[PDB]
């Protein structure tokens, strides 16, 4: 019988295994003097829910358009009300049956009219720098071809189709195609024409492609230069001029430049150059650098380098995959400002303009092909395109287009085949093609741990332990002896580590120490630079970020796309402030006696001449002394001891005993750089003179006894509960032990190994730690001093249906002015539940006060939060913040804002000030409870209730990176234990 | 130092291990001619949140009451706005640290004033029939004592405290006490004075206690009677008169009555008797029956009996543990009306009035002591009161009070020590005490499987398989040979089985067949008789039942308290209608040729004389013939063949081929009984003449082809989807394959064994069965008949991120009037996910129609729902119900309402009628979707949306009892398979 289904031809094309058709050969993105017209601007746009209903009503001609409306191009069209963004991590949002597409497949028809002057005749082309995921292109009704590879460029010859004067460009874009099966990155699904559309003239006697080869001989200091140039795939006569180096040479010939200044992330020297034929001239920036693997080390210009990296996705909270150039420039500057020297273009090539910026500002770039088949893993990689011969031409095309576009840029030091694509024949074909085309850059691919077709050994989230074994070259052998010998001769990189989701990442210091210790370790790139939050508005008008599930998705992965060091608007998370310190390229170790500091230059090429070294002594009453010291330039990987001026040490010796003072030595930029202004801080170190342990008040005040209340100086206790009801007129609504915090994203992840793979958050829930109850055992007053007395309140804390508990005794004392509080915790019974030992989040106290707090001040670490395995960037000092600024605006609210290492604190409750001192404690202050914080899925869910929630912790657990990778390291875990700790409280009015 | 805590003495008493103090000896509940005054009525009531704040302001005197308000007594005070009900199953709602109580412990002070006339002097007492959980009692300010054992009676001597005229009774009731640790039944926590308070005169020369011994000699037919009577614990002279039996005997002497009619559940003969002393007379109902264990069988009056039981809690949706007498009488009648003959007073003694009702209506009762320590299990039974010597006197007291109150009632055939209390020394002490006090009744206790201190082997939810092994006496041996020999000589009872929560219970038939086959098997009691729903009202005014979590509980167990055969208002669930049939005490097997039926009397004592045997033949057009047949009385456990009148068979032979007709034979009550009216149906059986397989219409109509639509007779298809868009003018919004249903309570429970302990609901979720997607592969028309043609639509069904699917082909045909639909399902790829084979709920079609349905009619099984392992009570016939009555009002909405075995159906959509015929299918019709049904937590969440959701299933899974006990039995599971099935559709206007 005859077929009756609609749209079968459009679908057959969408299900095609082949690369796009009709396109010109893949080439570099080149700055040319050839006439060009950007077609970016307001286009017309019509959306159809599938191919079988996509009109074939002659719309490509642009006449009588039924159903079209304005839409900007470039755009991600779900960012403008056409459908909605959808987020999955691994899972595909359609049935997995390659190459077939779902019936529900948004089809976006795009149309623009433009004018072509005589500059574009006879020869011109149209260039598309990105279409997600399948484009069909018509000009004046003539089909030019199709596009596959959503983050790759395509060019179409319009010679003889372009007409002088008015032209009509039509583009039909399907969201889903066969290509969606190889584009399963962890990120928002976002169809659209999301990068530039450009009309370019191709004058006769021009230059189609250029391949810059600029090597460096670190022994002689010579440059090795060869600039290839071709037209229609054939080498051509062109002249290469490099004025700064007094060079004029033919394209195609290799020359030795007697002396060049080499390119690196640290010193990104670029030489302006032009290669020109009679009809066209291309402008280049040349950076001389050679990449080599030697002695299981990754070396640039003869030196092993340390990669201080991030994984950079392209995302904008309002424009989707369209990242405006000012945002790119700003965020790259922000990276440099936080000591980052390396970028991985996770997991596709960036906008083509990114490359010159990376060359100029100075990043080591891992340029990664647009390939990811992650969603096939859950079926044992059955049907994985990476090993399906039918996909070979498509996957080689992706790699070719990746390599050809960006091959001229000194910042690209590695090519990556893709990400999470399994192992297979087509990856090997992509590697072979790349090695043959460009042997000057090592190949990276983490998916095949045997490393058969790569030049570096790459892993993601390997533990600190396993990294140390790899750093020593003693990891376990591959079964294949030949492959094992190859892999052991390779240097090692963490292409993703210390997953930066929510509160965290913990354990960054432990990785860094290994990076510094073992040459084989190349460093690592944090997952990831940014959170992919998408801005959402309410009638109230407040903005908050949305994540998976906030846009109607049938299947999604929640907030796992908000997992970055900065939010979608590039506002730093605390983890970035900590990261900056962890990777700081100079180490400053200030001497205890304040006579000087040790300075190690951790850079690979530059000396310390770019830095001004500054000291300041701060005390309770502000700065006491400061200035600048002269440091003879210290060579890379060398060390010296710098003397501080004698006045500094004399100041230290003069300090009254127990008077706190902090000496800070800082390395700042001596002059404006391309990425920050003079005075910008790069590295720092401190020495602290600690305040004495606070003296307990003499217990000279007696306890008044009344029917329902007890008074001990400024504290009033409920006789029924034994807990304070006010202190110095400040109402206390509750006081109790805390063992729990509102789970972080990490606490919601499974820690693998052991028989227990409940997330820590679930272990806590099962154990009842979020719902502690207190039983009063007794209240007793005891002889103090000179008629005074102490008050002891004996309690037991546990939870419904549990037999384990802790005995908590509070001992109060007062001389009338200061209140002394001693807390003793003792385990009662075995803290085991569901067959596994219960771990605690904390050993602390929660004070719930019946008034709001306007200001929080403290002496300790800051200004930002710190937990046991974080806070590297929190320095010692005196800090003061309004209550709102004590919080951290994670998209999904969670435990955050603790200030570990606090020696004193002051809360301002209107006209009263509550002071807390004692041996070091963590400080947290919130206008809402832990139960409201845990329940809240988005920041608007957090409502202040008129109270102050004050947390004083004697011990905290670490935060780890268990959402993906290692959990809390052993030294930072918190198993049930006995404890005791002392505090002092005072209210001033 | 000196103590300052408040309320320490009240708390010390609450934490006491001892039974109550001050009470009179435990005795029977006896009907006496002694003056009595019920103090039930409106009392005054004040609530305090804990003992440390409970005022000691002299309120016991009743003068100047500060803070008291009216409250009825008896009451569960959280049922009247004082606090709230709270539901936990196993978990305790307080920290487990016996004997200690939480600080948050509702204290309810109760006060009443009453008048005592000279009838109550010199001697009187106050009787309390239940206080949850700890009472302290004052009369005119004089403390009488305390109460422990919340469902047990306590009596206090008021002689010399009661004053003539006005008296003031004060009762302080704590919700929680040490006793809460032994009262952890799965049920609502409900403090209050929840049963009668009675002032009773104790005239001199009276009778305090009576112990009736009324045995039966089934060989001679003699009664063996001895009636003990005592005053102050000493036997006394009393006269026992039994007029009906011409007896006058002294209390304390055993006599042989020459002939008595024995008592049983079937024939609950009772003889009125009075035992009287000079000062007092007690009225008894005596039932002569002896209980004996012989040949591993539980026998009454010389015969092994079959228990057809339920577990009966005491609950009322508005009054809590207060069950009004009219509700008791009504529900016991409803039980008899559903063939129930046995009750287990789960898990405490009932109201004392229950016992006479059970004697009179006729139930075999397992009278169970108020003891349950279930919450200690999760700690390995550490600190279990059942094995703690400090709790021995408290636990023996509970058993003593249980036994003494109810020992005179013939309906009590077993004493139970308690429930879910572990094993231990104090249970053994309770058993020893009981055996010594009353050797006439076997002891039951499931908690100790070794059965060391019991006389029957009791289990709960043993599988059908394990029950069959136990029935054959081949279960595995106990390690202790002596205990194994004892246990193998015991009969076996399921004290709880076929958990009746939500849709279900499945697998009842398989248990019953074993009960009938194996004498050792005593039968079983369903868990449980009623749902504990608590009525909740909204401003709208609709009522719905609340369950755990609906009342603010910090910890709770959700709808696990709504797990019954009837709802809280005693409205039957379908499971009750099925249960009634499963346990029917006569079996009627109607002959295929309609000449007669086989009749087996399944009763243990009665013959069939109480029944009238009626036949009716029904056809499409109603009743055709009917009448009554005379059956010579058939003895218990005998069998006969009854001839039907010749006209019946002649009617069968005369039927036109393929014309449906149902012969039903019924056993109804020939006369009013005490529990139902004449004509009440007890047993039934059917023989069906099936309609022919419906003829497929001749495919003589062609398919019209248009741009966006196809027409094939009355069906209009969307050319883009291939699915029907209307049939005979009825709009079709969607048509697709179904494999999933909204999980039942059972589907949410874990099926133990295997490596997969995900609940089936979770397996489905993980597999994507709730979110199927369909891809169109092709649409084709093919040669039919006489220019007609068939239309085939080829699809594939799968779900996002899955590689497995099914190929579904629809083949449509029409002669213009009827529509023929053939559906073919074929597995594509292996249906495995997370390492385990995916199971299906169904193989069906969902039609979503764009109009509402008012009426649903069908020929099949009904009227109520039926699933493969249920529907025993759905009989063959013609049924017709409004749409709302097709649903089942489970408290948590869930899959329900399917009518399996349907041969034809008619949906009325206004003025059009949609008819569906074909080989047997299940029918379901709803005004809302499956996703709305699954999301709904309470019935108000179900909103109609203007559509009709029609489900036609070719195969269904069973429902099992996996919420607690066996899941779906193997024969009723539904693994992925290929399938094909035919339907016919027709619309009449
Ligand atoms: O934010 C996650 C991050 O993960 C990398 O790979 C992870 C993956 O997230 C996780 O789902 C799987 O279980 O483990 C992998 C590594 O162990 C991805 O490469 C990255 O793009 C992100 O998706
Ligand atoms: O000032 C030293 C600099 O070294 C670069 O390699 C790095 O990218 C910069 O962020 C900064 O740390
Ligand atoms: O390439 C081999 C590797 O493949 C990964 O996908 C897998 O998680 C590792 O266990 C390792 O076997
Ligand atoms: O009494 C012994 C029994 O105790 C139960 O609590 C337990 O679940 C059974 O496995 C059996 O060992
Ligand atoms: Na994805
Ligand atoms: Na992510
Ligand atoms: Na918290
Ligand atoms: Na939260
Ligand atoms: Na309970
Ligand atoms: Na229950
Ligand atoms: Na359903
Ligand atoms: Na539901």
UniProtKB/TrEMBL annotation, chains A, B:
N-terminal signal peptide: none
Annotated binding of (S)-malate, by residue: 291, 293, 435
Positions contributing to beta-D-fructose 1 binding: 24, 26, 401
Binding-site list for beta-D-galactose 5: 196, 325
Entry binding sites for beta-D-galactose 7: 773-774
Record-listed beta-D-galactose 4 binding positions: 186, 496, 499
GO molecular function: beta-galactosidase activity; carbohydrate binding
Gene Ontology cellular-component annotations: beta-galactosidase complex
Annotated residues for binding of beta-D-galactose 3: 186, 419-420, 496, 964
Catalysed reactions listed for this entry: Hydrolysis of terminal non-reducing beta-D-galactose residues in beta-D-galactosides
Alphabetical list of Pfam families matching this protein: Bgal_small_N, Glyco_hydro_2_C, Glyco_hydro_2_N, LacZ_4
Enzyme class: hydrolase
Family to which this protein belongs: Belongs to the glycosyl hydrolase 2 family.
Protein name: Beta-galactosidase
Organism field: Arthrobacter sp. 32cB
